[PDB]
Amino acid sequence: LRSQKLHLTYIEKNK
Amino acid sequence: VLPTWSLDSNGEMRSRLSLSEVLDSGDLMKFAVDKTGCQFLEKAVKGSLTSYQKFQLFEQVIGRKDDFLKLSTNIFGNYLVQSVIGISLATNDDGYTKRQEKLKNFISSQMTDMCLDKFACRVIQSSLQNMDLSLACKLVQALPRDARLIAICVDQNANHVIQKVVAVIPLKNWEFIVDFVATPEHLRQICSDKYGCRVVQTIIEKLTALTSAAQNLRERALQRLMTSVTNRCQELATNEYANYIIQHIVSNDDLAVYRECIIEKCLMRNLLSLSQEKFASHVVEKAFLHAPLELLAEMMDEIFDGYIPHPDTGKDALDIMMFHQFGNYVVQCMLTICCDAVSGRRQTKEGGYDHAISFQDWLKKLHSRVTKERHRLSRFSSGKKMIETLANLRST
RNA sequence: CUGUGAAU
Ligand code: NA
């Protein structure tokens, strides 16, 4: 299991 | 420590002693601070007492200020003080008024000092519970109104005094505590404390559970505290202790309007990040478990189609959470919710419309990812539980 | 036991 936080770019609801 | 007249030939306290001999000797203060002597007095005051025996106990235990404080702050004497206070409140003689009045003046003058003491705070808690409400409120009026109230809320001992006030005292007399904690400079420093968060939660629980004026008082105090919590819920949800406050609000149906505000303005568009937090992941779970179905659908849609996959590996938000030390519990929560709804253990109808097909669609997406990564998931206990969860559902 | 909270 990973311990570091990984981010992904958010997608708007209308996109 | 014990007087020599009370000792046998070996130096130990004489067995079978009369309570009257201790009362008439003037050496009660030695017995009350001794383990053996105070055990004797505790059992003695449990039996029947004459009129003058009660008066002797009232004068020697709760009658003199310096002796009262010395016994209240003693590891053993605090039990005798509480017993004598109970006997004093149960004896409705002519001196009843002056006794409780003097008891009130003793506690009020040293309120904060007794609240912060490991043993004297028990005397205050037992007083608040058993005294006349008019006299117990005067103890509440002796609580500090300034920054010293922070010390009382976050102290290991004094925090239980506040919670006792919240439980037995009318809100009108302790509304100032709600205003104090709801202040921005006080909310985060008290909610983020081990003992202060217990104070805040107890306040929320009491304000949630008479006249329209009393209801208006309860609603306006809860509104003020909820506004402050929602204004800082991002910092509170990620906090080691304050996360329990956000969870309790989200999990309480009587606070629905505030739950949706926390979900709408704090958790949405931050689900992937908050799911990988040690403390906020518990908040995300509670949000998934208690959000209205309309907001639950938006939370599901954010995890499934709300993030651009990694341009190199192609892994999306579900992949990251599924293999994170804390995010994996959020994925297990989503799967359990969908399996419960499909198998008839969770509510799927709202507004007279069955949303079971939405849970089926989310279940398909979760089931297909577990299938695609079953090789890696079968090596984790969290992956094994997801595989077992889907196996039970396909047994049916 | 893959992950957090009260004083005799
Ligand atoms: Na667990």
Author numbering:
A (entry chain E): 76 to 90
B (entry chain A): 167 to 375, 382 to 568
Q: What do the study authors state?
A:
As PUF proteins lack detectable enzymatic activity, they require partners to assert their regulatory functions.
We successfully crystallized a ternary complex of FBF-2 with LST-1 residues 74–98 and an 8-nt RNA that was a highly ranked sequence from in vitro selection experiments (see below) and identified previously in FBF target mRNAs, 5´-CUGUGAAU-3´. Each asymmetric unit contains two ternary complexes. Electron density was visible for LST-1 residues 76–90 for complex A and residues 75–90 for complex B. Complex A includes all eight RNA nucleotides whereas complex B lacks the −1C due to weak electron density. The LST-1 peptide adopts an extended coil conformation and buries a surface area of 839 Å2.
